[PDB]
Amino acid sequence: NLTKEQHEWLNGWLELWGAWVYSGRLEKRMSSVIAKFMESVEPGRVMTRPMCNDDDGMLISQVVDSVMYIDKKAFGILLSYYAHGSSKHAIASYYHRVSLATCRREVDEILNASLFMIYPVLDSAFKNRKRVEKIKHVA
C-alpha cells in the first residue's frame, strides 16, 4: 500500500486540519470563570491539538472539497473521526446500529481509498505555492 512515513505525514496533517475545523462549531463546551482559572493555574488532561494558519487549511479544504464531492459517507466519517475523536470501532458500531465487522472493514477501506485519492493532488498543491518572503527595507 502506501509507505508509512507518508502515512504518518497525512495523519499529522489531517489531524491538524480536523483540530482546525473543530474550533468553529457553536454547540461546544463553554467553561465558567473558576474552571478557567483552575486550568490556567494547574492543568490536567485538558490539552489541545495544533491547528493551522488557515491559508494552508484553506487550500487543503479546497482540495478535499473538490475531490470529495462524489462521496458523502467517507466525508462524514473523516469529519466525525477527525473533528470529534471517535474511534473506528465507535463509528463502525454507529453505522452498523442504524454485520458490524464488515462495516468496520468498509469504513477503513473507504478511508484508504479517499486517502489514496487525496495524497498526490495534495503534494502538487503543496509544491505549486509561492512562499511569501519576509519584510525588507529599501534604504
Partner 1 sequence: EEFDAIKIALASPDMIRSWSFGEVKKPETINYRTFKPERDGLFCARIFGPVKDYECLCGKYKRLKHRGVICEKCGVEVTQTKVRR
Partner 2 sequence: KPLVGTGMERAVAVDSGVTAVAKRGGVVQYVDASRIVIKVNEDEMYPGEAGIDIYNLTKYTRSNQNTCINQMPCVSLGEPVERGDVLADGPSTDLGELALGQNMRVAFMPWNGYNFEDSILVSERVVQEDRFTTIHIQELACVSRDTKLGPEEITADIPNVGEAALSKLDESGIVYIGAEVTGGDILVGKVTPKGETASDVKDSSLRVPNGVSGTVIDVQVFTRDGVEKDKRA
Partner 3 sequence: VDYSGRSVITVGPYLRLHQCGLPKKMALELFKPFIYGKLELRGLATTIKAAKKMVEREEAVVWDILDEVIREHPVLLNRAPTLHRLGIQAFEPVLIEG
Partner RNA sequence: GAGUGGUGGAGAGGUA
Asked whether 52 and 20 are in contact (CB, 8 A), the reply is yes
5 binds, among partner 2, partner 3, RNA, none (CB under 5 to 8 A by kind): none
- Contacts of 126-131 with CB under 8 Å at 24 or more apart are 129/59
- Confirm or reject binding of residue 61 to partner 3 (CB under 8 A): yes
131 binds, among partner 1, partner 2, partner 3, none (CB under 5 to 8 A by kind): partner 2
User: Which x/- pattern, by CB under 8 A, does the window 35-54 give for partner 1?
Assistant: x-xx--xx-xx---------
Q: Smaller CB distance to partner 2: residue 51 or 103? A: 51
Residue 110, CB-side half-sphere exposure with 13 Å CA sphere: 17
Asked whether 81 and 91 are in contact (CB, 8 A), the reply is yes
The b-or-e profile of 62-77 (16+ CB within 10 A means b, else e) is: ebbeeeeeeeeebbeb
- Confirm or reject binding of residue 28 to RNA (CB under 7 A): yes
38 binds, among RNA, partner 2, partner 1, none (CB under 5 to 8 A by kind): partner 1
Q: Which residues bind RNA (CB under 7 A)?
A: 19, 22-23, 28-33, 36, 40, 45-49, 51, 84-86
